[PDB]
RNA sequence: GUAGGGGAGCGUUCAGUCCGCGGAGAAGCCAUACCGGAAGGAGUGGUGGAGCCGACUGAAGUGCGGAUGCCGGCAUGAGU
RNA sequence: CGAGCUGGAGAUACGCUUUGACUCGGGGAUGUCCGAAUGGGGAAACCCACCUCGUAAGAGGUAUCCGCAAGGAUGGGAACUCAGGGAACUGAAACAUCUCAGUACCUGAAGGAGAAGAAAGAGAAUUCGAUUCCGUUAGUAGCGGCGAGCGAACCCGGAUCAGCCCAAUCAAGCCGAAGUGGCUGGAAAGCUACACCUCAGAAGGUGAGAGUCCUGUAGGCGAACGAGAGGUCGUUGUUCGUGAAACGAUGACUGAAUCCGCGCGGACCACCGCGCAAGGCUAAAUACUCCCAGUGACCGAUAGCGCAUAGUACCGUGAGGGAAAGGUGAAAAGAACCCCGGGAGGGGAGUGAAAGAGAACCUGAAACCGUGGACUUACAAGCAGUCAUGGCACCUUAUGCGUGUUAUGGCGUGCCUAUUGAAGCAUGAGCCGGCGACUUAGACCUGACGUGCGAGCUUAAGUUGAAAAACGGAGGCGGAGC
C-alpha cells in the first residue's frame, strides 16, 4: 500500500524551525538553513559547558587578587599562603569573600602572611 | 470433559493439548491463514517501462544542468514507481500437525473459559430465529457475547441474522480463527467433536 | 463499563525470536550501504568464475551412476523388530521406502537371533552373519 | 455526480397525495404533492415555502423584488398518511379497475 | 570514533482484534516555558467542520537537505 | 412500467402524456457521403458516366477472384495461436564459437481459441498404448572456445479423456417483515425510555452515525417471447555447437522393396525387441484478454490510466509526442433593495446553522509580500551562533521560574561529496512544499533465531468444500561410505 510521507515531514521540519529564534534571516525561517546552523550549533552548545567551567574560575581569581593585591600579597601567594594552613579551605567563594566582605578578605589576607614569613 | 446440553451429556472424552494453549502456536495458526485470505493486488506501474513515456530527451551535455533519460523514471513525477508492488500471493503451507494442534489447542482454550456443546435444538422451530433468541436466552446467551455455532443442520443456522452475538458456521468446516474470533463456542455437532482416525 | 483492552485474539503475542524486524540500509543519520565505490547497481561480479583454480585443475574422471543399493543395515532387522517380515514389502512400514533403485543388506547391527531376510542384495559377512544365528538370506533367480 | 439514484429514480408516491414532512424543519407539516421530480428526488409540496427575489434585468419594467415560491425537498417527508401519521405501505389488490394496484398501512385506503 | 558488524527502540500508512471517541464538534492547520535517554509524546487554547486516538498483532510504495534530481509555487538581479 | 416526460446543460417558449407517455427489454423499418469500397476518376467524405425501371422526382445495376449454379473471397480485430523471414545491444570482465534468440521486429493465415492428435511412437517392463496442459523426475542424462553458459525424456501423480473415416438457467420486471415519545441540534437515523421484525443486521441514500423512513436485501413470483521411402553433397531440429553422432527435415543429384516384405531401437553387425510410413477430418482439458460483473491488509488527485477524461490543448512537414485541471450549501434559499465606482471591487441589508460557506466558493501548511506593536540599531570588520552578565518588556503548562528582546564580554574556519589532507579560490545547490533510491520472485542454495513433529519429517499438481479447509504421497530430505 502506497505510503506519502505526509504531516510527518512538516512536523520534523517545524521542530528545527522552532528551535532558531533570533536567528538571523534565512537562519531562522529556511528549514534547510536553520537546521544546518543547528549543527554548528551542536558544536557550541556541549563544548561551551565543559567551558565555562573554565571562564568562571578566571573571573574567580582575577578578583581574588584585586582585593589580594589590595593589601600586599597577590593571588599566586595568598592562596598558597591559605594553602600553608590546611586549615583554610575556601576557594570557592573567596572571590565573593574578597568582592562583598573586605572585613573579611583581609583578615584571610594577614591570616596568610602570618602562616607565610 | 465437557457436558452436553442437548440430548444427552457425555463429555470427559477427549485428550486436550499440553500444556495448556499456547498463543505462540495459535499464532504462528492465525496468521498463516489470513496471509492465504490474503488476496494479490497491487496496483503500480513499478515498471518505468510500464508507464506511459517516450524514451531519449534532451541532450547528455551542454544544454545546461539535468542529465536525463525518458521522463518516466522512479525520479519523475508521474515517471514510475521504483521498487513499487506488484500482485503475487503471500500464502505458503504450514505443517498439517499444527493445524491440527491449532483448533485442538483453540477447543481447549474455549473449554478451560466458555465452552458449550448441543445435541440438536428441536428447541427451534422453523426458522424463526425469533425463538433462537429465545432459546439463547435460558441458554445463557444474553446477547452480551459473540458466539461462534459450528453444527451442519441447514434448518438450525438458517436462525442467525442477529449481529454482536452469534456467527454460524457448517459442517464443523470450523477454523481456528473464527472460535478464536468470537467469544463462546457452540460447538454443537458433536460430529467433529468426538470421534476421528 | 471502566476500561479494559482485554486480552485474546488480541492477547495472543508472537514467541520471541519467532521473527526479527528486516533491515532497511539507514542505520543511524549515516548510511550509504555497499563498499564506498566500485560497486553498486548491477550484479556480475558473482562468486565462481573459472580461473580461479576452477581451471587449471587436472581431470576428466568419468561419470557413470550406474546403481545406487538401498542400505537396510543389520541392527534395522536385529535388535529390535520380531521378523516383522521382509519378504519384499513389510520392510517398507519397517521403514526402507526407497523404491525405484534395488536393496542391499550390510552388516551393521550386532546381537544374534534368527531371523530370514529377503533383500534384492547382501553383502559376504552381510549373509555370513544372519543365518549364522538363524535366518535366510534370499536373492532374486 | 451519481444523483438521486442511491433510491431509483422511484418517488414513492404522486404528484397530488398529501404527504407529512417527517425529518428535518417543518416536521408533520403536510400538503398536496404538485412536482414529484423522480430522478433528482425532488418533492414540491404546499408545506415549505420560500420568499425568492427574481433576477429580472432589463425585464420589461423590472419592478423585481421578492416572489413567495416553494422549494422542493427529497425523501424527507413520507409519502401518503391516513392514521394522520406517518405509514409504510403495504396491503394492495384491486379495484373495479383490477386494472390497478393499491397499497395501504395498519389500515387500508390511499 | 570513519567503512563495517551486533543490540534496543521511535514514527508513517494499510489490515485483523480490544477499549472507545466525536456537531456543546473528528482529522488537518496554528501557538506553547510540559513529558520521555533519543527517535518522539501529552495538556491547554485558536482554526476547522467530519470522521477519528490508544493497545496487541500482521503487511509495508514506511521516514529525506543534498543527486547541475522531478513537478509546482515564490524570491534575487530591480523597478534595473 | 405506471406520471411523469420535454437528452448532458444547468434557459425560455411550444408542447406531449391511460384510447398510458417516458424509461427498460426484444424484433422491424429508415439509414446522405467516405471508408475493403468495388460504375470510372480521385490529392477520403469529392468530380464525371452509362444501361435498365420510370410521374418526373425517384429506384437499381454497373470491381476483381473461385465456381453451371447457389454460394464463397477481398476489410477490420487489444492480446492469445501457427506459419514464412529473423536482429543487435548484451554475456563470455576483450573476441570471431557460443550467449542474448529464434526473443525483438516485419509479413501471411485463423479462430474464440489455436496448435497437436489416433503410432513405420515412447521404453527396456518381451511395459505403456492418440494430442495437449499442470506436478515431478532434474537442474539429473547430456550439450559447451567441454569456457560463459545451455539443459532433456521415460517412469509416477493430476486436468481431461472419442476416435472415426479414405485409396488399391441467464436479461426487463413485480411482490417483499418490523417504531414511538421525549432530549440535544440549524437538521437526528445520535442520547434516553419502552416496542417490534429477523430463511431478508449485505449495501446506498435521507439536513450527523439508518435492521423496523426510502431504495433495497432473504425469500417468492416473473412475459409475448429472447438467448444458451534409402543414399551422396549442402545444412538443420531434439540436450546434439561434428563429434564415433543416430533419427527426424529438405535445396541439389540420384533412387528401393513388399512377407520365408518394410522402419527403427543413436555409428556399425547378428541376435532380441517395439511399430507398419508416403490420404484425411476430430471434441475436451490449454492461451489471451477489447467487453462485462464481483472482489481487493490497491490508489484516492505531483497517487491512480496519459485522461475525475483529453489523446484534446499544445509541439512536429511527418512518423510521432502529448499536458494540467476536483470540492458553495443539507437544500440555491446563489445575495431583492441601498452606499462609493464607467467597471472591476467592495460595505451594508436580506437568505443560511454557518457568508469565522458567495460563486477567481471544504481545509488552507511553507517560501514569498505587507501593515501595526515591542525591544533594538547610524567608531563598525561581521558562517552569523554559543556560553556569561547587565538593560527593557511581558508573565494562560509562566511571577517563581521563566518567555521575548537586546547591550557588552569570551569563544567560534557553512553543509554535503570526494579525500593523504576541505572554511576552503575543490563538487553540488536560489528558497519552500510535495515526488524521489537496496526491492520483488523463484517447491533455488547457505546459515541465525523460533515453532511442530522427531529417527523419522514433508507434500506438489489437483479434488471437493469455502462469509471456513480438509482431502490429495507421484515426489523430495535424514537413513553408508569409498
Ligand atoms: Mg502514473
Ligand atoms: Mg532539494
Ligand atoms: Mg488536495
Ligand atoms: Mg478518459
Ligand atoms: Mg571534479
Known amino acids: 500500500p502506497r505510503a506519502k510521507t505526509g504531516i510527518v515531514r512538516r512536523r520534523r521540519h517545524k521542530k528545527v524551525l522552532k528551535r532558531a529564534k533570533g536567528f538571523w534571516g534565512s537562519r531562522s525561517k529556511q528549514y534547510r538553513n536553520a537546521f544546518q546552523t543547528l549543527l554548528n550549533a551542536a558544536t557550541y552548545e556541549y563544548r561551551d559547558r565543559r567551558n565555562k567551567k573554565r571562564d568562571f574560575r578566571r573571573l574567580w581569581i582575577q578578583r581574588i587578587n584585586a582585593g589580594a593585591r589590595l593589601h600586599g600579597m597577590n593571588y599566586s601567594t595568598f592562596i598558597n599562603g591559605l594553602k600553608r594552613a590546611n586549615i583554610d579551605l575556601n576557594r570557592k567563594v573567596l572571590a565573593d569573600i574578597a568582592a562583598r566582605e573586605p572585613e573579611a578578605f583581609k583578615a584571610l589576607v594577614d591570616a596568610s602572611r602570618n602562616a607565610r614569613q | 470433559a465437557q457436558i452436553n446440553v442437548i440430548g444427552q451429556n457425555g463429555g470427559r472424552t477427549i485428550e486436550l493439548p499440553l500444556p495448556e494453549v499456547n498463543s505462540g502456536v495459535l499464532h504462528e495458526v492465525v496468521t498463516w491463514q489470513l496471509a492465504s485470505r490474503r488476496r494479490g493486488t497491487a496496483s503500480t506501474r513499478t515498471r518505468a517501462q510500464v508507464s506511459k513515456t517516450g524514451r531519449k530527451m534532451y541532450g547528455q551535455k551542454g544544454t545546461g544542468n539535468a542529465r536525463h533519460g525518458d521522463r518516466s523514471v522512479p525520479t519523475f513525477v508521474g515517471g514510475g514507481v521504483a521498487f513499487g508492488p506488484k500482485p503475487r500471493s503471500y500464502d505458503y503451507t504450514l505443517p498439517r500437525q499444527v493445524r491440527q494442534l491449532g483448533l485442538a489447542m483453540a477447543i481447549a482454550s474455549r473449554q478451560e473459559g466458555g465452552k458449550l456443546v448441543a445435541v440438536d435444538g428441536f428447541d427451534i422451530a422453523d426458522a424463526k430465529t425469533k425463538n433462537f433468541i429465545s432459546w439463547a436466552k435460558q441458554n445463557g446467551l444474553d446477547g452480551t457475547e459473540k458466539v461462534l455455532l459450528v453444527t451442519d443442520d441447514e434448518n438450525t443456522r438458517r436462525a442467525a441474522r442477529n449481529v454482536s452475538w452469534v456467527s454460524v458456521l457448517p459442517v464443523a468446516g470450523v477454523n481456528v480463527y473464527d472460535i478464536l474470533r468470537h467469544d463462546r463456542l457452540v460447538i454443537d455437532a458433536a460430529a467433529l467433536e468426538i470421534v476421528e482416525e | ?141 | 455526480p451519481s444523483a438521486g439514484s442511491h433510491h431509483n429514480d422511484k418517488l414513492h408516491f404522486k404528484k397530488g397525495d398529501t404527504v407529512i414532512v417527517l425529518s428535518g424543519k417543518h416536521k408533520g407539516q403536510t400538503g398536496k404533492v404538485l412536482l414529484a421530480l423522480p430522478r433528482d428526488q425532488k418533492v414540491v409540496v404546499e408545506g415549505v415555502n420560500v420568499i425568492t427575489k427574481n433576477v429580472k434585468p432589463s425585464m420589461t419594467n423590472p419592478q423585481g423584488g421578492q416572489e413567495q415560491r416553494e422549494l422542493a425537498l427529497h425523501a424527507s417527508k413520507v409519502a401518503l398518511v391516513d392514521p394522520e401519521t406517518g405509514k409504510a405501505t403495504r396491503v394492495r389488490k384491486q379495484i373495479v379497475d383490477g386494472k390497478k394496484v393499491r397499497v395501504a398501512v395498519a389500515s387500508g385506503k390511499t
Open chain 3, 1 to 141: 463499563h471502566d476500561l479494559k483492552p482485554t486480552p485474546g485474539s488480541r492477547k495472543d503475542r508472537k514467541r520471541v525470536g519467532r521473527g526479527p524486524g528486516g533491515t532497511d540500509k539507514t542505520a543511524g543519520r549515516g548510511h550509504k550501504g555497499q563498499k564506498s565505490r566500485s560497486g553498486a547497481g548491477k550484479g556480475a561480479f558473482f562468486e565462481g568464475g573459472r580461473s580461479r583454480l576452477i581451471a587449471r585443475l587436472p581431470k576428466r574422471g568419468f561419470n557413470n551412476v550406474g546403481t545406487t543399493y538401498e542400505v537396510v543395515k543389520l541392527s534395522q532387522l536385529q535388535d529390535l523388530e520380531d521378523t516383522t517380515f521382509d519378504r519384499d514389502t513389510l520392510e517398507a512400514y519397517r521403514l526402507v521406502r526407497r523404491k525405484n533403485r534395488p536393496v542391499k543388506l550390510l552388516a551393521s547391527g550386532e546381537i544374534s537371533r534368527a531371523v530370514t531376510v529377503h533383500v534384492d542384495a547382501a553383502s559376504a559377512a552381510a549373509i555370513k552373519a544372519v543365518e549364522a544365528a538363524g535366518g535366510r538370506v534370499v536373492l532374486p533367480e
